[PDB]
Amino acid sequence: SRITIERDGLTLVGDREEPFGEIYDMAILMHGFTANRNTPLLRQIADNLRDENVASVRFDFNGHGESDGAFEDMTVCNEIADAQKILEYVRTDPHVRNIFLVGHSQGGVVASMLAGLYPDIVKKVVLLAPAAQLKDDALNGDTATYNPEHIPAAIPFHGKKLGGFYLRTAQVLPIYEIAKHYTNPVSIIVGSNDQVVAPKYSKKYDEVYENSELHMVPDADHSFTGQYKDSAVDLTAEFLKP
Amino acid sequence: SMSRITIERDGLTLVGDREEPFGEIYDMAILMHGFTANRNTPLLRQIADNLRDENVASVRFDFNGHGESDGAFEDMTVCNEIADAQKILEYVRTDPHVRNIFLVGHSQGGVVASMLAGLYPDIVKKVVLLAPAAQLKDDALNGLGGFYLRTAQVLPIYEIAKHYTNPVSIIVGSNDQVVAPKYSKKYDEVYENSELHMVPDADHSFTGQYKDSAVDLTAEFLKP
């Protein structure tokens, strides 16, 4: 069912899904850039988790979906703050037992960074085509292009203006630095035909994590479109089966 | 003239004091306080006036969870205070009355200023750091919200800060018992264009006569 939480005066909208029972593990499900908390990928994860007794939360990040905040005011850092506030509401739920994180694309960056900040609280992590390229995209100019040494107050996209503060913080994000601090198990799932995030980024998480595995879905794209969604849902509920 | 201005940041209202010299065009300094303080301590209130009298305008805001500004102190982090200062920077950036933008930060607001300049080294033209609390990172690593402490342990203070290569002045009191003087020296060393000014016998808050010496050194660096 439907829940809301506040972070710095903005409201975040999410959906909560529960299995039969008073106590259960709980996964926090994080989407990617310009996406929402109702992509097919995340809902099928929420349904399949529920069938193996894993509750789950999935929220619209600030500036996305039904949550508050202009798109051009989002950064990966206030998204990390969004996730800290979902983590805390989950952490105070008397029905939650263990806490898992599940992020796709830019949400996988968020998940891995919250995990390195909370390595003692988060017991398993699933990164789904995590988008660490965004730091290298910000440093280069193309994410079309711009000038990475004089970045404007916003760069036009599809109507949703991308804030210049996202880019400047994207360039200096300590993505792998913070994530290596998490030594509990990590499953990384990537598609063999992902044209959005090159292989190196996932292969780099696998080599930096101390307790990780890197699955590859043949022929799968960045989004895990259609049939590819099943192989990514299967792997993710595999990893999280209690 | 002096003004009260408000500002929004993710739906939280931040509360500031704008002080200007009489004219249509001038430089301006953003002045940021430290943890537990507010925009209107004697030291920041003094730097504002001395600057007003050098044709250097100034705004000073209460950080989120501080003074009059919105938000709880437990929800404060060094990252959301950067995001406060960024919103103020955008504000200042968008005044046709502003020529050059300087940053000034005491204690924790000095870490914030060093990090906002490291992100905006094309826009920020001059920085003055008074007793920068870069030690908060090492305090958090050895042993106020839990989120403040978890991010403080992994803050890349010097590594962002160093991308700023315009002139920066670092003024510490020599008898600081809050932040080791060792943190003002790593700043002056990693900065490609900086200067160290130690005020003998001054404490971390630069009180009494030491406030006057701190605002002299501050104002004479930002002086045009």
Numbering used by the authors:
A (entry chain A): 2 to 144, 147 to 245
B (entry chain B): 0 to 142, 165 to 245
Paper text:
Feruloyl esterases (FAEs, E.C. 3.1.1.73), a subfamily of carboxylic acid esterases, are mainly associated with the release and exploitation of HCAs from plant cell walls. In this study, we aimed to obtain and characterize a feruloyl esterase (LaFae) from Lactobacillus acidophilus. To further investigate the active site configuration of LaFae, crystal structures of unliganded and ethyl ferulate-bound LaFae were determined at 2.3 and 2.19 Å resolutions, respectively. Seven α-helices surround the β-sheets and form a core domain that contains an active site with conserved catalytic triad residues (Ser106, Asp197 and His225).
The crystal of unliganded LaFae belongs to the space group of P212121 with two molecules in the asymmetric unit. The crystal structure of LaFae contains nine α helices and eight β strands. The β1 and β2 strands form an antiparallel β-sheet while the β3–β8 strands form parallel β-sheets. The α5- and α6-helices form a cap domain (from Ala133 to Val175). These structural features showed a canonical α/β fold of esterases. In the LaFae crystal structure, the α3, α4, α6 and α7 helices, as well as the β1-β2 hairpin, are involved in the dimerization interface. Several hydrogen bonds (Asp9-Leu11, Asp94-Lys86 and Leu118-Arg171) and salt bridges (Arg8-Asp9, Asp74-Lys86, Asp121-Arg171 and Asp121-His153) were observed at the dimerization interface; however, hydrophobic interactions (Ile81, Ala82, Leu118, Phe168, Val175, Leu176, Pro177 and Ile181) were predominant during the dimerization of LaFae. The substrate binding pocket is comprised of the β3-α1 loop, β7-α8 loop and β8-α9 loop regions. In addition, the cap domain was observed to be located above the ligand-binding site and this domain was hypothesized to have a gatekeeper role for substrate binding and release of the reaction product. Structural analysis shows that a Phe34 residue, located at the active site entrance, acts as a gatekeeper residue and controls substrate binding.
